[PDB]
Design a protein around this ligand. Structure first.
Ligand SMILES: [Mg+2]
Ligand SMILES: [Mg+2]
Ligand SMILES: [Mg+2]
Ligand SMILES: [Mg+2]
Ligand SMILES: [Mg+2]
Ligand SMILES: [Mg+2]
Ligand SMILES: [Mg+2]
Ligand SMILES: [Mg+2]
Ligand SMILES: [Mg+2]
Ligand SMILES: [Mg+2]
Ligand SMILES: [Mg+2]
Ligand SMILES: [Mg+2]
Ligand SMILES: [Mg+2]
Ligand SMILES: [Mg+2]
Ligand SMILES: [Mg+2]
Ligand SMILES: [Mg+2]
Ligand SMILES: [Mg+2]
Ligand SMILES: [Mg+2]
Ligand SMILES: [Mg+2]
Ligand SMILES: [Mg+2]
Ligand SMILES: [Mg+2]
Ligand SMILES: [Mg+2]
Lengths: 157, 208, 68, 294, 169
RNA sequence: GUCUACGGCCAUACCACCCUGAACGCGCCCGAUCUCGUCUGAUCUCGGAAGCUAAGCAGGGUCGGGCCUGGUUAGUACUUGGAUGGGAGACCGCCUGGGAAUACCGGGUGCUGUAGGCU
RNA sequence: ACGCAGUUUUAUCCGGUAAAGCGAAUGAUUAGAGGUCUUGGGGCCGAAACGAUCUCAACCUAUUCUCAAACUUUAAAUGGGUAAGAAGCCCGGCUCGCUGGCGUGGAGCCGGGGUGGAAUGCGAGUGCCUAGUGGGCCACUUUUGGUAAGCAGAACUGGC
RNA sequence: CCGUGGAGCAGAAGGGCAAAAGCUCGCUUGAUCUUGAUUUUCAGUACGAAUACAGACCGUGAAAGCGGGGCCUCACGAUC
């Protein structure tokens, strides 16, 4: 009864946001998609051929197929009782890289360089990521001035 | 005319007189200012206003009765054009009536139950001003008595405040005369135009 | 004769009994659906790998063993 | 009283695009010239950019990257007096000449001069470059006519014919070369050959020298103030094509400083701007005091 | 003492709005052909009316644009007919004007009884060198402020050349 | 310190008005016999170069409008979770954590890549 | 140590609701002030005259009060996806009819080299057969119709 | 002369579009033949619609490309 066709909940989602109507900029096209990249999917209302669905907006998947001017993605979609890895064919205009994997590759390269320098000079560099520790026992300063006194203010309207 | 006890607390979403209603009758109130409409700014220094305490609806007929009562007490109290009253709150919500006996069982039950448009109410948030009366400095008791006599005629509980601001504008009455005397605030009818100094220089050259 | 038409209550508590796990994803993923021109490339690539990859790769294995 | 001016117009206004407000591209053809299909992943699509300007034509080969366009090789019309084309910088002969220079310069940079000679005797035929097996493949490139309209006789096609006889594998159909009969759909090679060798200006010089010497001294003054006569033009470009095909190497200039900086006013600072405002205050106040009294 | 900024007749527009299509419209095109020495170009209506009887895509009017020597010649004939006397509100604020004539054989062409007598609308635009920026394809910009033509510049040019009379009433 | 050709980001780079531009360069400009296309060489196409930076263009300015960014707005409006908390209800106060926007005020107003050229 | 997670963190994307906004588009809407183009209408100088003048409306300019489930520049909290390593790095070479300036790109194959890569908790993976079930209800909070209900209808979580 | 969609895009609305997806003009039949994969509804069955390809034979354009119906979301139907 919700008129189950394609693209029905999308008065806002496939819209080009604001002061960005018009032609697509070409840096979206001129990018390199190899098998094994990790891509975000974001709807573009200007190119109406290969929009994915309203389901896969914002989902982040793996690339496995490359054609002339589109790309095939595998995306984990949740349905009723289980999640499934589906296979979508999306044009290039809806796609961008996730910066998360590139940040992780920078982590891996820093870890390899620290590992080589550590095996070189015998240092134990602790190249894991430690979460935010509690504050160490620091030592505050109150020179010159007594601390400012605060009190709750009287009500007015 | 159904009793206003039921058309009360803001339950349903706001439903304005618009493209989709198309059959709502006219609201009860039509004019909103009663006193000296063409009053200039320094002709009335103070203003007393009426703050709502509850979150509720007010009906257009109730606003109609209240502005008439306040108007009558003002023109009996401090003379004609000794006040400028403004109902700051306008009705735009449209309430619905699903009326029956349209006396037997045999018309319909609750089957087609999207009601016809009854009339117009005004939605109120807590701390929103209903009425504002700007008067002379001598008329302080008359404003309090007038808004007291309107307080009984609105539903619910709401209080009466005497503003710190000059006029209907948003500027302080203490800073007001000290700051209009030289530089910034040019009077504009009943309103007051603020000037920044980040304009073209033609404004400052047209001044002074 | 009226009944409750549609609901989604008591559904998440059914779904998380056995657990909403992922779809396994083993190594060497299924290769159907990929570009037929690329697939026609890769099949002859594989069989000529297995054809000609004996002699020169054996030479290079001997060379890299002699180096190290 | 006339209109409602414009106030939220600015707050909602999109600029078109940086190149589009200057008006130099369209992007509706650039989005099909630039973009390489993703099956090849790295191999760039080379654009031959030929731009006609008053006093100068520009032949460049570029390709596209995400940081910007990367120009591989470029050749300009004013280089031709070093090759022996003294005047005639924007004629169809200069178009063919610059295309031939650009093709020879690219092939000299890549070292594929001795193979892929292309065409030497200028005929204006449908000479498409065949690749030679057992050798490195031919350079393939695609035109950009730009905003200029492709009409039979547009000298972007002359630059095309120059590059093609130089030996670039550029796909082209013959029906936009000049000399092509538009009613009867045959193509004439001899007329286009005459138009390449430049006997149009030869006939027009003979026409002016018969009809009116006033116009012949009005235009063509730079021609007669070094030298131009039609037989010398028809043998001059014949010399010039061989002079290019023997030495396209382009000797870069020494650039150098040897100069005095100082041409353009810089941005005046915040305090200086605010003190301009303060002087504009004080002078008007002084006027308000003085001239109202006197 | 001003560099190459000369008011010159950019183009001259000639119009005949016949109320109908067919015979009288064709004879009006024949009139404009005999004036200009070039074939005219027709006009029509996006919407009709039925009150004065035009329909959609009816060949209502003819017109022509004349540039250069013939333009200044036919402008000379027009000011010759109207005795160089043009009122102030004949000039538009943006610098162009139009004045019009009736009785098309005032200009000096033989009358034929076959064709007839038509009312012919003359419209003059003024041009300075540099106005051809806004029309061309590749690079197009705003014209600017000091370069454009004013009411005052147009009326002073018409005072200078042809010795026109301005008629402020 | 600049421009041209091709660009990337797509208003910090628009719009209005006023100043200044030496050298190259872009233009404006002078003409239709060939190629071309129009009612019209105005637009498009083509052979140039007597003039001109007047305009575009390039730099600067406007207590400029807009944009971007940062304060104030404001720990306010809201809000995950909780209470045998208050309240007739309407709603409101508290613990726990997170946390916004306009008027108001201050600052800026293109940055770059490739190839080429002038001081 | 394998693997996993109704969880958190560390990154990274996504949304257009609460809220707010109208001196930002659209839609409604209150009142004052300024201005002189446009008329029609009143008055006055008058045979009459855009001859001159006063007024009216409309118009425009900056302002002002209030709004929106089928409006929106902005924009939360809660939330959804992905990543947090040996299936990964790095080196060297072979094959390709695909691509092509190029021994170029991309895939595949082979050989070699170094596992200590957020917190916390746990044993996981997988196949067959199939019963009963397909009449629900209530509670916090968010919500649609209704005056309202121990009413009808939804969402998240728990209970019966 | 101003004119950032205030118009038009067959239609109900929403989205999108300005040297364009709008208007005019010139050519035209890609509204053709054929295997598959995938999305959408979903039990992860179908019809319908759609996406990305592959191989022919073409249209167009100078060319890059575009095109296998309508700028997108509806316009349709098993066994026998
Ligand atoms: Mg009763
Ligand atoms: Mg049931
Ligand atoms: Mg084009
Ligand atoms: Mg001609
Ligand atoms: Mg012709
Ligand atoms: Mg000309
Ligand atoms: Mg200039
Ligand atoms: Mg100047
Ligand atoms: Mg500013
Ligand atoms: Mg500037
Ligand atoms: Mg919504
Ligand atoms: Mg709200
Ligand atoms: Mg059983
Ligand atoms: Mg069962
Ligand atoms: Mg049953
Ligand atoms: Mg609560
Ligand atoms: Mg119930
Ligand atoms: Mg029941
Ligand atoms: Mg314009
Ligand atoms: Mg629409
Ligand atoms: Mg087009
Ligand atoms: Mg095909």
């Amino acid at each position: 009864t919700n008129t189950k066709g394609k693209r029905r909940g999308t008065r806002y989602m496939f819209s080009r946001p604001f002061r960005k109507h018009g032609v697509v900029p070409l840096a979206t096209y001129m990018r390199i998609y190899k098998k094994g990249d990790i891509v975000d999917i974001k709807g573009m209302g200007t190119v109406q051929k290969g929009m994915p669905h309203k389901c896969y907006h914002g989902k982040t998947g793996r690339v496995y197929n490359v054609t002339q001017h589109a790309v095939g993605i595998v995306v984990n979609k949740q349905v009723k009782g289980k999640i499934l890895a589906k296979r979508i064919n999306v044009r290039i205009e809806h796609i961008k890289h996730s910066k998360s994997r590139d940040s992780f590759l920078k982590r891996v390269k820093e870890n390899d360089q620290k590992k080589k320098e550590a095996k070189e000079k015998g240092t134990w560099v602790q190249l894991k990521r430690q979460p935010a520790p509690p504050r160490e026992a620091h030592f505050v300063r109150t020179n010159g001035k007594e601390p400012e006194l605060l009190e709750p203010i009287p009500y007015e309207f | 005319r159904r009793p206003a006890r039921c058309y009360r607390y803001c339950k349903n979403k706001p439903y304005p007189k618009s493209r989709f209603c198309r059959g709502v009758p006219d609201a009860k109130i039509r004019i909103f200012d009663l006193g000296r409409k063409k009053a200039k700014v320094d002709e009335f220094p103070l203003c007393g206003h009426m703050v709502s305490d509850e979150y509720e609806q007010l009906s257009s007929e109730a606003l109609e009765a209240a502005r008439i009562c306040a108007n009558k007490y003002m023109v009996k109290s401090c003379g004609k054009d000794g006040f400028h009253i403004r109902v700051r709150l306008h009705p735009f919500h449209v309430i619905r009536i699903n009326k029956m006996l349209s006396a037997d069982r045999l018309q319909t039950g609750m089957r087609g139950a999207f009601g016809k448009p009854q009339g117009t109410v005004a939605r109120v948030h807590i701390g929103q001003v209903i009425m504002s009366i700007r008067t002379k400095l001598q008329n302080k008791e008359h404003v309090i008595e007038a808004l007291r006599r309107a307080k009984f005629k609105f539903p619910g509980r709401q209080k009466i405040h005497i503003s710190k601001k000059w006029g209907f504008t948003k500027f302080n009455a203490d800073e007001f005369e000290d700051m209009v005397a030289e530089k910034r605030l040019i009077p504009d009818g009943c309103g007051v135009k603020y000037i920044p100094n980040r304009g073209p220089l033609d404004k400052w050259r047209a001044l002074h | 004769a009226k009944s409750k038409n549609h609901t989604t209550h008591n559904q998440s508590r059914k779904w998380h009994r056995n657990g909403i796990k992922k779809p396994r994803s083993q190594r060497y993923e299924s290769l159907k659906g990929v570009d037929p021109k690329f697939l026609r490339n890769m099949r002859f690539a594989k069989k000529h790998n297995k054809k000609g990859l004996k002699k020169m790769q054996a030479n290079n294995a001997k060379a890299m063993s002699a180096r190290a | 009283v006339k209109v409602v001016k414009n106030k939220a117009y600015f707050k909602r206004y999109q600029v078109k695009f940086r190149r589009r407000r200057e008006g130099k591209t369209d992007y509706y053809a650039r989005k099909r010239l630039v973009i390489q299909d993703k099956n090849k992943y790295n191999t760039p699509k080379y654009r031959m950019i030929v731009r006609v300007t008053n006093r100068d034509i520009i032949c460049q080969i570029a390709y596209a990257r995400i940081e910007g366009d990367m120009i591989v090789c470029a050749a300009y019309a004013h280089e031709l007096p070093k090759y022996g084309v003294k005047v005639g910088l924007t004629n169809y002969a200069a178009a063919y000449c610059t295309g031939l220079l650009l093709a020879r310069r690219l092939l000299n940079r890549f070292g594929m001069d001795k193979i892929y000679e292309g065409q030497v005797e200028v005929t204006g035929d449908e000479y498409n470059v065949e690749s030679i097996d057992g050798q490195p493949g031919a350079f393939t490139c695609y035109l950009d006519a730009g905003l200029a309209r492709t009409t039979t006789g547009n000298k972007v096609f002359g630059a095309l014919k120059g590059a093609v006889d130089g030996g670039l594998s550029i796909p082209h159909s013959t029906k936009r070369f000049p000399g092509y009969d538009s009613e009867s759909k045959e193509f004439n090679a001899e007329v286009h050959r005459k138009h390449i060798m430049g006997q149009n200006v030869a006939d027009y010089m003979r026409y002016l020298m018969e009809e009116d010497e006033d116009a012949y001294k009005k235009q063509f003054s730079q021609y007669i103030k070094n030298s131009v006569t039609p037989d010398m033009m028809e043998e001059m470009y014949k010399k010039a094509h061989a002079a290019i095909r023997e030495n396209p190497v382009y000797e870069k200039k020494p650039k150098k400083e040897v100069k005095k900086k100082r041409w353009n006013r810089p941005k005046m600072s915040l305090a200086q701007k605010k003190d301009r405002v303060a002087q504009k205050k004080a002078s008007f106040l002084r006027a308000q005091e003085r001239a109202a009294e006197s | 003492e001003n560099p190459m900024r000369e008011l010159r007749i950019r183009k001259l527009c000639l119009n005949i709005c016949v109320g109908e299509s067919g015979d009288r419209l064709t004879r009006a095109a024949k009139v404009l052909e005999q004036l200009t020495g070039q074939t005219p170009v027709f006009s029509k209506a996006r919407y009709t009316v039925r009150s004065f009887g035009i329909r959609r895509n009816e060949k209502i009017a003819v017109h022509c644009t004349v540039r250069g020597a013939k333009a200044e010649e036919i402008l000379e004939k027009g000011l010759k007919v109207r005795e160089y006397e043009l009122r102030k509100n004949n000039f538009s604020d943006t610098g162009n004007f139009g004045f019009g004539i009736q009785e098309h054989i005032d200009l000096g062409i033989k009358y034929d009884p076959s064709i007839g007598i038509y009312g012919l609308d003359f419209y003059v635009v003024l041009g300075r060198p540099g106005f051809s920026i806004a029309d061309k394809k590749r690079r197009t910009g705003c014209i600017g402020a000091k370069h454009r033509i004013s009411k005052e510049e147009a009326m002073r040019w018409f005072q200078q050349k042809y010795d026109g009379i301005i008629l402020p009433g």
